[PDB]
Amino acid sequence: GVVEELVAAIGAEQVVTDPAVMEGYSHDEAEWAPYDAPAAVVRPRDTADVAEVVRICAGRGVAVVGRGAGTGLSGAANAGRGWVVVSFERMNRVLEVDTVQQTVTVQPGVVNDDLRARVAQDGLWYPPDPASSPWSTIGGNVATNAGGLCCVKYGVTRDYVLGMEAVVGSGEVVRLGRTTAKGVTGYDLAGLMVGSEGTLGLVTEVTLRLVPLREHTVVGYFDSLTDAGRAVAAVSAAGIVPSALELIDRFCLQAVDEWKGEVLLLARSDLPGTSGQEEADRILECFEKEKAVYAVRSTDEAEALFQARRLAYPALERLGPLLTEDVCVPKARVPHMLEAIEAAGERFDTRIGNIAHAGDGNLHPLFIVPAGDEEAKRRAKQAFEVIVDEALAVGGTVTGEHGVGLLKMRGAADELGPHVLAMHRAVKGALDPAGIFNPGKVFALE
Amino acid sequence: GVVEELVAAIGAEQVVTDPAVMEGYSHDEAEWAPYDAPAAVVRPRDTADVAEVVRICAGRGVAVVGRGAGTGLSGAANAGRGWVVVSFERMNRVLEVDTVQQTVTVQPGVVNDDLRARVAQDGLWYPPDPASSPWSTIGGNVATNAGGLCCVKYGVTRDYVLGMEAVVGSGEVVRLGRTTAKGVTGYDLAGLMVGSEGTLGLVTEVTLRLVPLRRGVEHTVVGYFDSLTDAGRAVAAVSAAGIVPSALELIDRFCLQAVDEWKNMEGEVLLLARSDLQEEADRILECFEKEKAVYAVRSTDEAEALFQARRLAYPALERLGPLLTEDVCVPKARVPHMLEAIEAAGERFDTRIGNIAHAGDGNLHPLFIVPAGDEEAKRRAKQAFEVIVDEALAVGGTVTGEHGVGLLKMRGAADELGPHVLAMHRAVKGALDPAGIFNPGKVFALE
Ligand SMILES: Cc1cc2nc3c(=O)[nH]c(=O)nc-3n(C[C@H](O)[C@H](O)[C@H](O)COP(=O)(O)OP(=O)(O)OC[C@H]3O[C@@H](n4cnc5c(N)ncnc54)[C@H](O)[C@@H]3O)c2cc1C
Ligand SMILES: Cc1cc2nc3c(=O)[nH]c(=O)nc-3n(C[C@H](O)[C@H](O)[C@H](O)COP(=O)(O)OP(=O)(O)OC[C@H]3O[C@@H](n4cnc5c(N)ncnc54)[C@H](O)[C@@H]3O)c2cc1C
Ligand SMILES: [Fe+3]
Ligand SMILES: [Fe+3]
């Protein structure tokens, strides 16, 4: 009967309990991730309301799962029987853009693009652009440490989180991190909150640092995954850093070309003036010493090839359920990793489509399961399970940006090992003594 | 005995007990920071030996304080009576330079420059260049989260720690962080170890990210001023008028004519600037002639000696007596107000405080030199730097920007963090160090 206490705690129009308005709030876009009907879905208005839902929930042992827009692919925001889904959709204001400090102060509910458009008016820029930029929230991007296409040279969300206001413990509002451009005082707790996937506390206000408002595409029509890619084991080994570098295959494109060589490799270079034309002709030398049917300098605003890469996951989702994996391996092991994905596609008769942020060795293998073809659905799980077990042996990690959540919990336990898992339970026990903040995700308590 | 177990595990040429050969291992350069003779100073050879020192001391409640080169300015490496000083001076090798991944894998004892010179051979660059680059270690810079001079565009040491190998708890050797260029698996535990000042475990290996060695545009900008008050509106204007510089420092003549009594190589405020792009290179002048300036030459030649003077400013003064240094960092828009307040606090406590500052990001270094014979001047200066810390907190800054909390800034940091954050600090250290052996009583005070 936690709902009666919540409505007496934070009004009656903040707490929603209708089970029909909850099926959309109890899961993200991760399919086969066990979710259930929660007890209540709270829509807090300010930090005080979150400080009450955490306080009510800490005295009862009721689980609290934060939720932004529910666009995760690992089930990180999925609810359980009796949980409380704190929806930050009402805290969606940008509270400041310090133009001289080059920082912005945002609430966890502001959408990624809504933030980028706002800071653009003041000549500042927020680099991290995850392929879900028009939908994901800053509160979600901070807890998952989401990365984008420009992470090659600009970094992930952690590279811009300066400080934050969180609700931790039994409901204490604390200020974490610095607000300046330098500061070592204490521990790096504001950083520990990044990538924690909401299992240590709810962020109710985030800072973030900005950069001034910083164009050459590269293109390359190639064939197999064994080759083609190998220009990524060469661009990093030979030619500088491309402002972007993706790896999408024709298999995903002719599913975007229906919804309004063989495997391409786009690259970018954003340098003003003559410094900048050479990055676009420096990023070519790697592309023709490797088969190369076409490969044209290009750079003709076309750009149409990068919207296709962004709409790679917005496609193949209305064509059936989509299972996605997200491994990140060393850049020198991308050629074999593409070999293992295509070889795992025949060991389990499943034709795995490949998209990848090739600029840092982060691959997104993806297979589309026919809502009627069963065995390809069950070989793919085993096929996507050998991919993670292979990416771990080459020296990579089970996830590169999407987070652990639920679907990558086992494989992640193998990477961290028994000793690191012991520290995870110890850390969460200190900052979440009641065990209410998204329990059983990333690691399993017990 | 307690030394008997150290000698029984790996104690032949690793364990030293001579009290004369331990004072150089039991304290750093922080003046008036309580240090004392430890019980033993271990100089481990590999990660396994550290796992033995932690295992012995965890079962006995004996404190362990890590040591790199002992160049801290906050007493972060100071030992206590009966502690064990783990000296990483024997782990001073770079064990890898991944050229395709653009990473380096180094041991905690490697000197900061020793790392950059090594990676320079392969056309790669390690940006963070702290003013103690010829002496401090990478293991120390990771534990302190040290920053450099051209950091105002590339970031601090934390911005380059990818993964690490640490000895945590009762002695388990663990791998923290990734080695690739992406990875969110688990918590950012390797990051929690960065900037922890060795109070959660000893780092025995850190992986670091590198950047290509671009050259060409080393446009510098000099320009002596008249006062510290009017070298405000010109540091807050280089950012508001557009685009931050590759570097921007602010040193005064008292430190310059303290370097000139050595390598005999103008005004009262130098303020150097940099630009690595090229336009703008005449635009960072406009902040200097719109405000008062005795001089200002966009000089691209060598001009470059003045930066060795800025770097060697604390390597200077080091010969003029004991030096009390502070390290506050305030918002960039509040540097002008801070420089007025410190110089005004120099007469409210008539101690003439010399000023160096990373004015490009708001990190100020007020410093006073103690005559060492005037006793009250020890207490006149102490309170003068105390109102400076209390002013940086009320203005919206932090008690430390790069030097770390350590010992000398514990009272000020406790006021900034507050009771709730301090409670989380003890809870974390209690969880990862249940025995309380990893540098106890630093950064925060255990109840
Ligand atoms: C088409 C498409 C493309 C995508 N491309 C990318 C990509 O390139 N890179 C990438 O990283 N991701 C991508 N994503 C998914 C991405 O991981 C999520 O969108 C993002 O990580 C967070 O989104 P959210 O906030 O909407 O998620 P949610 O599922 O709502 O939750 C995010 C997590 O944070 C927690 N949480 C939310 N708010 C708070 C708070 N204040 N405090 C603490 N915890 C909180 C939740 O517990 C949850 O674990 C993509 C998704 C889609 C559909
Ligand atoms: C002239 C001068 C200029 C300086 N400039 C800067 C600057 O620009 N920026 C800046 O940040 N600092 C600067 N410093 C001080 C600087 O913090 C230290 O030089 C450096 O951060 C620590 O290096 P170290 O190994 O010498 O530290 P130590 O004196 O050994 O102590 C460092 C701290 O980290 C711990 N530690 C050491 N090794 C390890 C390990 N392997 N694992 C865990 N903990 C460990 C110690 O316990 C101690 O608490 C300067 C100092 C001087 C004298
Ligand atoms: Fe992605
Ligand atoms: Fe400094």
Residue numbers in the entry:
A (entry chain A): 3 to 216, 220 to 265, 273 to 313, 316 to 460
B (entry chain B): 3 to 267, 272 to 283, 289 to 313, 316 to 460
Copy text from the publication.
X-ray crystallography revealed a VAO/PCMH-like fold with a solvent-accessible active site that harbors both a FAD cofactor and an Fe(II) ion.
The active site located at the interface of the FAD- and substrate-binding domains is connected to the solvent by a cavity with a volume of 314.6 Å3 and an area of 490.5 Å2. Unlike many other members of the VAO/PCMH family, the FAD cofactor is not covalently attached to the enzyme, as it was released upon chemical treatment with SDS.
